Amino acid sequence: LNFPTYDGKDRVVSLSEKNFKQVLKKYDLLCLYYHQFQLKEIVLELVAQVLEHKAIGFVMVDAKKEAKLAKKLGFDEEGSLYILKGDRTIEFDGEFAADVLVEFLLDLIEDPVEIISSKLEVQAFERIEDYIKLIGFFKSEDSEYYKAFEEAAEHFQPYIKFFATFDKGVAKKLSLKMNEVDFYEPFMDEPIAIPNKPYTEEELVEFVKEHQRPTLRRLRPEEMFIHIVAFAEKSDPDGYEFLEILKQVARDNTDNPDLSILWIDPDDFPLLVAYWEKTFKIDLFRPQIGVVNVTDADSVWMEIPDDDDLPTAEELEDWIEDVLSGKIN
Template sequence: MNTASMNAWNLVFLGLLLTFGQLSWGQKGMDFPEYDGKDRVHDLNAKNYKSVMKKYDVMVVYYHEHVGSSKVAQKQFQIEELLAAQVLEDLDDEDIGIGLLDEKKDKAVAKKLGLDEADSIYIFIEDEVIEYDGELAADTLVEFLYDVIEDPVEIIDNVRELKGFHNIEEDIKLVGFFKSQKSEHYQEYEDAAEEFHPHIKFFATFNPKVAKSLDLKLNEVDFYEPFMDEPVVIPGKPYSEKELVAFIEDNDRPTLRKMQPYNMYEIWEDALDGEHIIAFAEEGDPDGFEFLEIVKEVAEDNTDNPDLSIVWIDPDDFPLLVPYWEKTFDIDLSSPQIGVVEVDDADSIWFDMDDDDDDMPTVDELEDWLEDCHAEDTDVHTSADAFDTKGATISHRYCKFVSVILLWVFFFFLIFASLF
């Protein structure tokens, strides 16, 4: 995983505090969270890492670059630890801790834990290690942690739960019908689910009526691509864990997938021949919704084409990046756009959306354009890399400036508020 620099991580801690602070302020006035003396943020080292990690059901480990020896760097790091401790007070019931590993001082510990990339976030739960490939934002990280602590398989037992299953369309999902939770075939399914949790949704039912409505036979598993109504029946039932894992790995790049805050780096790095087909569309906007339906139809028509993979980005999910994308790609995101982008240097070419024509492109027009793009090399140069996966999507200098200023301003604000 290529996450943001340490300065962007600072913004996570600050953002978490501000997020929970805003919730508490709205309910209790200017009632700041106070550090309750519980050590939830730990500097991990060779002597303590085993004992510390045993204390928590979930351990979030930030493998960070070495902290400099200057007083400013040290003080800033101390403030980050205090802010993180205050934030985790709100998550105390979930038994989640944060461990900090220094790339220079704790390289041996990182190696023992299997961490090989600095400036990365790893989540340890039971016997699994989950890499976080998402946006460094408060709500995104907390929501991801809540997903992590959920069971890897969700059971469908009634009509209401079945409706909830059908309402999930943005994620890869699987559903299987088994005799009971004690069934050996269900155990294999559950073991496979743990390998992909929480990135892929796994469902199961033991209810024959629910299975009938899903057209599932006993010990059978259906695989649903995002935005596809009809599933693919995984062949060869009953399955072993190994067979299920192999099938999913062979089919984990959907024809159409949505980039979301929790998976943005993972998706961006998973490009076809170094390129992405990007569709920008606001689902809540009438034009965006109409265009998205056209893109979905293109995907459905080409679901068996291994050379077609479209990434849908809703600009509303990434408001701070909209000006950056518009400048980088020279496009207007107030209206839908679709283009082909090279991952390494952000060279791109975009479908000509005629501003004077209110009509959206037809499915055939869009398919023809994509075929033409695939047949030719993309050779439109842009000014910068729109997705810097080795750092923050906003420049490191900007992150550093903002994080330092906000951390110190908020720190002194806390001191000032405590005087009254």
């Protein structure tokens, strides 16, 4: 009923060789912790307790002990959590917290393609606009074209969402022809149809990698970790009004490939944004947009002194253009 508390049972096992390959096929997902770190230990134990009847294994691989198995799997960063799913290895880069870890694993454990089989689900599909989506129409799950699409979906999981229908009426409402795949940029209503259908998996992966930096995109707690970053609380009328300005500049520079704004909602990342306030010396809980140096953590911020008089989209665009050309960094 209330919140779970860790019961003391140690479920995070230590995985050796020979013991290795048995547990990879016992589970859907293998969670590997590569080696004062009682905080990460206890978060991992609580996630393992809460998910104990899911098809997820929790193991730890010591840097000095199972260096054999760590070399066998390619574990560079010590203190990092790696997820194995079949033949694939996923390094978790999100916040090492129980909520974020649970959400990440439950995203990874499901099939990479979500099937839409109802016309009433298409309206809901079209209104979900916060992430990159791909959707295709195939004859069935057995099709070689579905298989190529599913294999591409596995390559981007869980960061990019793939969808498919096998129904003519659903596909008609999505304006999809047979074996065609539409690509949806975030916060844009009109999809891009991938050229020269039907597609191999290499054709799908290459298209998605070209279009992986859209004009505006929303940070997620899973996928994270020169750089234009905008801060807007969607739950606040100020931040929401600013978000609508950012959406307007996104639809004006779909032609511009050198424009990629990362929108961070502070309500989605309250600890991270508060920590960044100490580094950037600015109030990031009111509307801001800046460019950050990846190395030196230097920053320059657009002047938004008055949240009752936010910049228009043209004023944002002019500041953006001065930054790419060279205003300051």
